[PDB]
Ligand binder design. Structure first.
Ligand SMILES: [Zn+2]
Ligand SMILES: [Zn+2]
Lengths: 264, 287
């Protein structure tokens, strides 16, 4: 209800009902933001741009605000997610950007590194903090994720859940899905090396959001390793962005997000 | 223009014998390097973007930089450097939080065409709250983001051409007085300081003077220029070569996060040295 106008939620619910997954791309820079936005507009695909707490450590609100207004100006649904936020203070600080100027649409409240009772308790409290500001939330039931553990995390108020199942244990996956896939969206982590077939089986069994980092960002690293000092700076920027954009477009085709924005 | 944010900086710098560091950047690392350097050293600054920044990222770098400027605890404004195409100038000027100032650089055209286009483009910018810089001559050379002058001759600035440009309503002038964009080569830096003072004497009280091609300059050269009216010093390679060196040596060897940190630190250190050299260090206290 405080989430009634949240832009991030329709993406996963739509993906789940239309048997595809949203590409959720971790980026560290403006070149990454551009690559995602170009890929998505070009493949008529929805997307998410994901930032780590480091983006705020490093640039205060600047990467956040820029990514936010870039996705909102986009011609396909693109929203902004804080990935793997493991400190309560940085979650609240990120969430505070929404009491302006757009900030995050969703935050992964990742308390998985805490003891499970303290994980549960913190998650609940930070989720309530983000929801008060209009912000959707994802959590990790972090030893693998049982269907029982998943239901405990549903109770905290998360919107999406990031199960541990070898990422592979597909039997474990659909059991999680049958138990909780009606109350929360499912999020796949460690997707960087996966193939179409793995993505297909993950999607059939509930995945509506696929996190990617190295598969895209390694393209940025390859160009700089190979071309820095040899290409002018402007050209390096163009080349890293093209390389990253191409990598995002592949993922969009692998997870059937290509074309889907037409119907959203 | 009464409410223009860039104008006071050069005014203040001129009356207090220093220059504003005007640092060209291509990326968020450079934007962060400038804000940090400027806040650390308590110095005003300007962030310079090339037309390439709009060509490449539409309004993204412009918006990121303009916003960083506003949020800074020292005076920092945003300048379009070397805009050499009337169409791009209007496109940039239509953006306005966009640019506080724009360089209407028509120096590639004949003198009379340069004056003609500069006059009308200044009108267009002024209508939109935007201060302007023009080049009453032709500096030779190219940089990444700044076109070559191949097949064009150098044109040194006279007081008379300077006077002609003051009537266009520009705020700042970039004189050609022996400075060169890019590498000076074996002949070294050979500036005509006499020409410069002659310019300053003729128009200095009516317009601010802007130093281009300053990358390899020393403190003593800076001091000579500032004593002759230079209130804005443009820098590029001095700063962005640090990004290149760090990437050249370390990409593939450090996490991307540390890569971004290291280029920004290295660029920040290069900016800080300029600030000291041109005596802008500490000046934000009285602004
Ligand atoms: Zn992850
Ligand atoms: Zn220049």
């Amino acid at each position: 209800p405080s989430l009634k106008s949240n832009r991030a939620l329709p993406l996963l619910t739509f993906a789940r009902t239309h048997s595809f997954a949203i590409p959720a791309i971790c980026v560290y820079n403006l070149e990454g933001i551009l690559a995602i936005i170009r890929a998505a507009e070009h493949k008529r695909s929805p997307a998410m741009i994901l930032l780590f707490p480091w983006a705020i450590q490093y640039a205060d609100s600047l990467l956040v605000r820029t990514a936010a207004s870039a996705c909102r100006a986009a011609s396909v649904p693109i929203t902004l997610h804080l990935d793997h936020a493991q400190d309560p203070e940085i979650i609240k600080r990120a969430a505070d950007l929404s009491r302006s100027e757009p900030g995050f649409d969703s935050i992964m409240v990742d308390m998985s590194h805490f003891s499970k009772e303290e994980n549960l308790r913190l998650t609940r409290e930070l989720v309530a903090y983000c929801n008060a500001r209009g912000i959707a939330t994802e959590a990790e039931p972090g030893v693998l994720t049982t269907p029982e553990e998943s239901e405990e995390f549903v109770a905290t108020g998360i919107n999406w859940l990031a199960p541990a199942f070898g990422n592979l244990d597909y039997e474990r996956l659909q059991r999680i899905n049958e138990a909780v896939g009606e109350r929360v969206g499912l999020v796949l982590h460690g997707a960087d090396p996966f193939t179409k077939e793995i993505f297909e089986k993950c999607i059939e069994r509930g995945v509506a959001k696929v996190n990617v980092n190295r598969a895209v960002n390694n393209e940025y690293v390859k160009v700089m390793r190979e071309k820095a000092g040899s290409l002018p700076i402007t050209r390096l920027h163009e080349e890293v962005t093209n390389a990253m954009q191409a990598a995002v477009e592949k993922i969009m085709d692998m997870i059937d997000s290509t074309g889907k924005a037409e119907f959203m």
